[PDB]
Design a protein around this ligand. Structure first.
Ligand SMILES: Nc1ncnc2c1ncn2[C@@H]1O[C@H](CSCC[C@H](N)C(=O)O)[C@@H](O)[C@H]1O
Length: 233
């Protein structure tokens, strides 16, 4: 295990993510995200407001803004370089999306998104970054913004995913919890763990299924793919 370095890696979780956005090129969302995105819409062109948590460069989101022109995207990420990288992109349309630095385990989302304002939150490959101790914090932060009948679309690394089977016991922070070389972490989800996180934080399970996919020598990538709902009043 990494012992004290863990507290160091946690303390620097933003920085390594910020550094990751430094060195790397801008450079994944399945159709399920896009297809389920529209299923949250009752009127055929109902205007939907979506929070894409952990936006990164929003490489996946920005086409979705073009593909569907009648949705608003509150996008946040705690990497400042990440945000500017989306700020710099020409596709950025201040009308389409409000992007803002937020560490979801620290910053109340009501600073930028009105409470119960968003139709759908996308937790795509983000919860694996945050420390498992603090994950429910991300879920509490996003409950505040979810309309009381709306849902969270979650895709993330799942148990026994390729990356989990590639890591040496030296990258292992703990059970199903690993640090990538650049110091960003990957937690490899199990259906039960995510379910409890969502149950504890007040959501209701719609879909919680492992999804197996072919990496682009291939061992399947295992992604835990799920939909959770804010219970209605
Ligand atoms: N506590 C936190 N608050 C905000 N963003 C976080 C975070 N922990 C991790 N992240 C973000 O998690 C992301 C993992 S990759 C995100 C991009 C992905 N294509 C997507 O659609 O979500 C990084 O952009 C990182 O900055």
């Amino acid at each position: 295990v990494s012992d004290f370095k863990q507290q160091k890696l946690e303390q620097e979780a933003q920085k390594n993510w910020d550094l990751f956005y430094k060195r790397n090129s801008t450079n994944h969302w399945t159709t399920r995200e896009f297809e389920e995105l529209r299923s949250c819409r009752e009127f055929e062109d109902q205007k939907l407001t979506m929070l894409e948590a952990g936006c990164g460069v929003g490489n996946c989101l920005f086409p979705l803004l073009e593909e569907d022109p009648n949705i608003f995207a509150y996008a946040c990420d705690f990497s400042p370089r990440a945000i500017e990288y989306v700020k710099q992109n020409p596709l950025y349309d201040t009308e389409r999306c409000k992007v803002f630095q937020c560490d979801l385990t620290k910053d109340d989302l009501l600073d930028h998104v009105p409470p119960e304002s968003v139709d759908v939150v996308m937790l795509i490959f983000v919860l694996s970054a945050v420390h498992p101790d603090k994950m429910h914090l991300v879920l509490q932060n996003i409950y505040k913004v979810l309309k009381p009948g709306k849902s969270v679309l979650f895709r993330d690394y799942g148990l026994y995913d390729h990356a989990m089977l590639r890591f040496k016991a030296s990258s292992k922070l703990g059970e199903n919890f690993y640090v990538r070389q650049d110091g960003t972490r990957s937690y490899f989800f199990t259906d039960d763990f995510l379910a409890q996180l969502f149950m504890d934080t007040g959501y209701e399970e719609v879909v919680n299924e492992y999804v197996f996919r072919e990496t682009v020598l291939c061992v399947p990538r295992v992604f835990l793919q799920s939909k959770f709902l804010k219970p209605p009043k």
